[PDB]
Ligand binder design. Sequence first.
Ligand SMILES: CC/C=C/c1ccc[n+](CC(P(=O)(O)O)P(=O)(O)O)c1
Ligand SMILES: CC/C=C/c1ccc[n+](CC(P(=O)(O)O)P(=O)(O)O)c1
Ligand SMILES: C=C(C)CCOP(=O)(O)OP(=O)(O)O
Ligand SMILES: C=C(C)CCOP(=O)(O)OP(=O)(O)O
Ligand SMILES: [Mg+2]
Ligand SMILES: [Mg+2]
Ligand SMILES: [Mg+2]
Ligand SMILES: [Mg+2]
Ligand SMILES: [Mg+2]
Ligand SMILES: [Mg+2]
Lengths: 362, 362
Amino acid sequence: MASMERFLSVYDEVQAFLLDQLQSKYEIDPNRARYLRIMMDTTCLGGKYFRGMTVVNVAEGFLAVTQHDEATKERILHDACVGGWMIEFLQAHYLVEDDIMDGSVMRRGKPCWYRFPGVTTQCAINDGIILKSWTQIMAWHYFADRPFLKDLLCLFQKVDYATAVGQMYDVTSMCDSNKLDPEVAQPMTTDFAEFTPAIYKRIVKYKTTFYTYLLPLVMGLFVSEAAASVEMNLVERVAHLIGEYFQVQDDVMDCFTPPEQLGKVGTDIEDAKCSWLAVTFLGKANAAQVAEFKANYGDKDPAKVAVVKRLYSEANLQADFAAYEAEVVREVESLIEQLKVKSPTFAESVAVVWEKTHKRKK
Amino acid sequence: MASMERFLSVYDEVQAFLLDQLQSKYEIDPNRARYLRIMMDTTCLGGKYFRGMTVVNVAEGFLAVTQHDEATKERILHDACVGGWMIEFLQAHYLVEDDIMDGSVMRRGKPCWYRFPGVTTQCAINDGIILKSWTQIMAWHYFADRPFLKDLLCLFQKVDYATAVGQMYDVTSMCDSNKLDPEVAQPMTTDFAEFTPAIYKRIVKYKTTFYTYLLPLVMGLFVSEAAASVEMNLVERVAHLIGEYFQVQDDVMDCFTPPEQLGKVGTDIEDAKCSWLAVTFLGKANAAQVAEFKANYGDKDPAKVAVVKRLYSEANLQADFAAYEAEVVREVESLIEQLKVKSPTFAESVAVVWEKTHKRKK
Ligand SMILES: CC/C=C/c1ccc[n+](CC(P(=O)(O)O)P(=O)(O)O)c1
Ligand SMILES: CC/C=C/c1ccc[n+](CC(P(=O)(O)O)P(=O)(O)O)c1
Ligand SMILES: C=C(C)CCOP(=O)(O)OP(=O)(O)O
Ligand SMILES: C=C(C)CCOP(=O)(O)OP(=O)(O)O
Ligand SMILES: [Mg+2]
Ligand SMILES: [Mg+2]
Ligand SMILES: [Mg+2]
Ligand SMILES: [Mg+2]
Ligand SMILES: [Mg+2]
Ligand SMILES: [Mg+2]
């Protein structure tokens, strides 16, 4: 796709800027420049670019309807690409650190970054820090003189914090809340009392929705100077709804989509995660199913994991998923109808966003 | 000390703000609030508060000589405390992640954060991310309306990036540059060709000087609206000089100061670090000393580490350290004399900063 290739051409610019600046201001040597170029490529490319391409689509929408000089159109488009890369680099940071946290093996069809033989956990941790740092370098360099600079930095910062809090909800979702204690080694829950749709919703709201949907949508609005032309409460409702759905699919694919197709190897069962599948299963199983789940969940043993997967297949969670999906379509369409009132162009971008999400197979 | 106790009283405010906001906007539950309060306390308290108390001292200096209403004096002092905590939280972030990277056992006289039984590497990584996030929450909340806000955020961001780059220089200092390669597992250097004072200086300049000295000094200037009243080139020279000296002491103590006194257990020998001791040693040893160093450095075996420590004692590095110290005193005094030209009060703060650094035994 041509537009994708163009968003990609701005990656090339941003990379050249970052690496040149390392040479000229940070005393980097050539082989460390090469290392960081490879690290940027592996952690920032290969994904679907949904978050990045959402910023661009939001801005393209407003450009079709807004009068500007050509030079202004070019500036806005370039701004939207740079903001999109800020979010892809933030994603790259999150993915580096999450793969370590989750004990993951594959990412975008390659070894996780920390599994590269020449990298290891020790360096990946810091490479993840550098990725985040680059988002700010990029923002201050490109947007220094833009009116939306303070708004963008302030939003970016809140969104990052929400995600970090969400990650803490996730990484501790298999422990009992009353037992959390830095001094005491953490046993896994035996009762699964906290595997509920409300608790699940809390995980997912913070860890994914803000950075995957709120952030790109609003950044599209910032670089378009169009924020005031939308109902923000609606922007937040729609971001959190499509965001949750997006995470539910991720959870389902972790279990049932082949690594060949997904580009990653699942760990949610093994990691004892509060996934949608585990929650929806406890939502419907009988006493004996519950017990066999309890004896097998959250263990790396392939035979225990297979037992969990059979239980999932037997419980017909495909039926629950259809019904959940049908409900989201209802609410997202409602939200999109409500957005046209003030912002038809934005509502349309949100439609496109939803369509792309709804259809994804990875 | 009373002033310390007062800087400390602003920690209490900042903590209450952060935890209340987690409850009211982030849907946190009480036991996770407790966990993060304990995490903030363990990772942010117990240090010497040098960086934090430098912001306060810089501002107190300008207040003694500048006319203000009392209300303004109180605002400036409070601003200096908050900026100081932003840097202590940044330090706490760096320390959490560094202890993981370095395989360290003790920090401020307690187990490293990731060694707490109830924490582990998996959670500490994210706790370190939250610490950094909190610096921005704190900045945007407290300084939203201040004229120095953009300057402070932009400086903070550049300083953080420099430190992250510096950390990459450190963590790869025991490998040959020409051999760095994400695809290939990294062998330790055999020739130690890159253990040179120039390369050492590069490590230390980036990993420590910006965040430990440039940042607090300039933040004191920002919250004092006094930046324009100094020669910034001199501020940078003095920060980088005292900063390097500060790191040299850290390196010496890692080897020779008892854990009981230091509050940490050294790993530089075991980690094959490019420390000042390793560099100054190669700076003077004879052929046979060089060989015995090479056969023992960068191995966790207590007998190999002891061999390295004997070689250090025999080479009389205490003599090199005295001579290095004497030279820094010369240059720092020169820089302080040069600061009085435009900024006597600032020169004095820098004198106090130097005196505290020069005298430290931990
Ligand atoms: C590091 C802060 C946030 C990370 C973050 C937030 C949201 C999602 N993810 C990563 C996914 P996956 O590993 O790609 O399947 P998850 O592990 O959640 O299933 C990672
Ligand atoms: C994580 C980014 C920077 C970390 C950073 C920078 C500078 C210094 N440190 C930490 C010290 P130590 O572990 O306290 O002795 P080092 O390990 O360098 O001897 C840590
Ligand atoms: C589920 C989440 C939030 C992490 C993976 O996100 P994506 O599936 O969008 O990953 P890439 O396209 O960037 O690979
Ligand atoms: C050497 C460096 C830069 C890390 C430790 O810094 P400090 O020795 O200042 O640690 P605390 O006082 O914060 O414990
Ligand atoms: Mg994961
Ligand atoms: Mg995860
Ligand atoms: Mg997943
Ligand atoms: Mg260390
Ligand atoms: Mg270190
Ligand atoms: Mg040290």
